[PDB]
Paper text:
Recently, two [name] effectors [name] and MvcA, were identified as structural homologs of cycle inhibiting factor (Cif) effectors. [name] catalyzes the transglutamination reaction between Ub and UBE2N, leading to UBE2N ubiquitination in an unconventional form. Non-canonical ubiquitination of UBE2N by [name] abolishes its activity in the formation of K63-type polyubiquitin chains, which dampens NF-κB signaling in the initial phase of [name] infection. Here, we report the structures of the [name]/UBE2N/Ub ternary complex, [name]/UBE2N–Ub (product) binary complex, and [name]/[name] binary complex, which provide important insights into the mechanism and inhibition of this transglutaminase-induced ubiquitination by [name].
To investigate the inhibition mechanism of [name], we reconstituted the [name]–[name] complex in vitro and solved its crystal structure. The complex structure revealed that [name] and [name] bind as a 1:1 dimer, consistent with the molecular weight of the complex measured by gel filtration coupled with static light scattering (SLS) analyses. [name] has an overlapped binding site with Ub in [name], but does not interfere with UBE2N binding, indicating that [name] inhibits the activity of [name] through competing with Ub to bind [name]. [name] extensively interacts with [name] via multiple contact points, burying a surface area of 2229 Å2. [name] interacts with both the head and tail region of the main domain of [name] mainly through two contacting regions, namely contact A3 and B3. Contact A3, involving the N-terminal long α1 helix (residues 11–38) of [name], contains six pairs of hydrogen bonds: the sidechain nitrogen of Lpg2149Q16 with the main-chain carbonyl oxygen of MavCG30, the amide nitrogen of Lpg2149F12 with the sidechain of MavCE344, the sidechain hydroxyl of Lpg2149S27 with the sidechain of MavCN39, the sidechain hydroxyl of Lpg2149Y15 with the main-chain carbonyl oxygen of MavCI28, and the sidechain of Lpg2149N19 with the main-chain carbonyl oxygen of MavCT29. Moreover, hydrophobic interactions between F11/F12 of [name] and N341/F348 of [name], and between V20/L23/L24 of [name] and I31/I35/N39 of [name] further anchor the complex conformation. In contact B3 which involves the α3/α4 helix region (residues 70–77/79–82) of [name], the sidechain of MavCQ38 forms two hydrogen bonds with the sidechain oxygen of Lpg2149D84 and the amide nitrogen of Lpg2149A85. [name] F11A/F12A, F11K/F12D, Y15A/K18A/N19A, and V20A/L23A/L24A mutations, designed to disrupt [name]–[name] interaction, all showed decreased [name] binding as detected both by isothermal titration calorimetry (ITC) assay and IC50 analysis. Superimposition of the [name] molecules in the [name]/[name] and [name]/UBE2N–Ub complexes also shows a rotation of around 6° of the helical-bundle tail region, where both [name] and Ub bind, indicating a binding-induced movement of the helical-bundle tail region.
Residue numbers in the entry:
A (entry chain A): 7 to 381
B (entry chain B): 9 to 114
Amino acid sequence: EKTGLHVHEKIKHMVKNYGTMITGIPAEILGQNEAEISVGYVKKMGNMKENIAEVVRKSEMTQPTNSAGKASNEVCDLLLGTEGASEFEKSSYQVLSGDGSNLKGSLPNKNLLVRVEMDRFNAPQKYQKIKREEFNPETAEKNKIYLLEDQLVYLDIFGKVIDLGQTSDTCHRLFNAITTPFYQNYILYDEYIDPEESAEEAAMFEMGEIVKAKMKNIDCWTATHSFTIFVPESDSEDTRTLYPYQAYWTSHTLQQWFSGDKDEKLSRLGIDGYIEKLALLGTTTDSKIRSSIYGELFSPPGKEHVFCTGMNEKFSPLRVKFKVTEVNPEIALQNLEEVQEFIDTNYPGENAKDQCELYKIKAQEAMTKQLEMRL
Amino acid sequence: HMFFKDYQKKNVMRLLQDSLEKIINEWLKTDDESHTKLKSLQELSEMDINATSFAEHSPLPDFVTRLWLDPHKALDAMDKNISKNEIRKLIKETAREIELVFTHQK
């Protein structure tokens, strides 16, 4: 089959079967590199053979990366070729609209690849009330609110002092109201605050409201997750589908994504249902909703309901940036076949499991050799 | 062919870059009052690709100088289609990225 859908089926099957070997990195340089970053772990007395062997046994070197950006780069290279991927990666992102319509309109019925950068809003969470004569932006804690005698300012992550537009009377009322010594250097957003408690708690709440309102027009966005979405054209009567592809930093690999079938499970939502969830991630003002959607779309398979709870509840606003480019199935299928031929030539076996084991054996022998040499 | 060659090469060089970042990031945690390490990293980031003299008695991590001097001796399984000069440019680019991040520029 020469369709985009067959491209999807093939890349999924190959990553499922071969994991890290889809990078085309030969086993020997993988093992030598692993030795070079593992020499310090080798116990330095005893007999060398089994110390080296022990570090080689606990090496994770054939386990695939869990970098989201690296997985996205791998998908882009395979489906577009290296030059096309580089051009796509340098191209501009667009911010997903509230209803996701600009992405929808960017998905004509051709074979398309979407790349997504998720951003979180890295707003200040702390303030200090301080006399102006003691406020030094060169040494004060950055990404923080500062309340002076008659001024309210934001020291941003770059160390720039940004005025928050409040009047002298507003700021002085705030400064004078916040007298408790423990609240001179404190958190901005207190779940349990209440202004009917006292003028002080009134002022702390009001300052939080002012800062939150002003922050909406300040660029605190910072990138936080990366993934891709393959949207083959519909070449049969079946409804068109999309397939998200990801790794998640420190959490799971692309191979685990496919082997848990999460690409397919999410494809069941349909193009519109998936985009609706993605857009709601950027519009919702409820942290339980934000958390639940984030887990549904982005957790390792099976962790959807525990990914974003407790410490990991998604309290900050998120936004979705996207870019789209056309996939040529002739190119992608040729690229994937070349990876397959490399694997079959250099790591032969009767099935993929045996080929993976041969790759691991060759890497471990290379690592043993390199470690013995350096020691 | 043509795709696989370039794709493999770029992924191997990314692997080496990851190793460079791990080793240099750890090494930078223990600089001195004169910023000896940082300064040597900054010098490396703009280094003449034909230079070797600096590596004779350098504060740089041993893996970095070994990879710079003779990458195909440091890792003798490295494909010969990865040139010494490609490795040296990779080392320079990595040093530049790390240096700007470390000095809170980026």
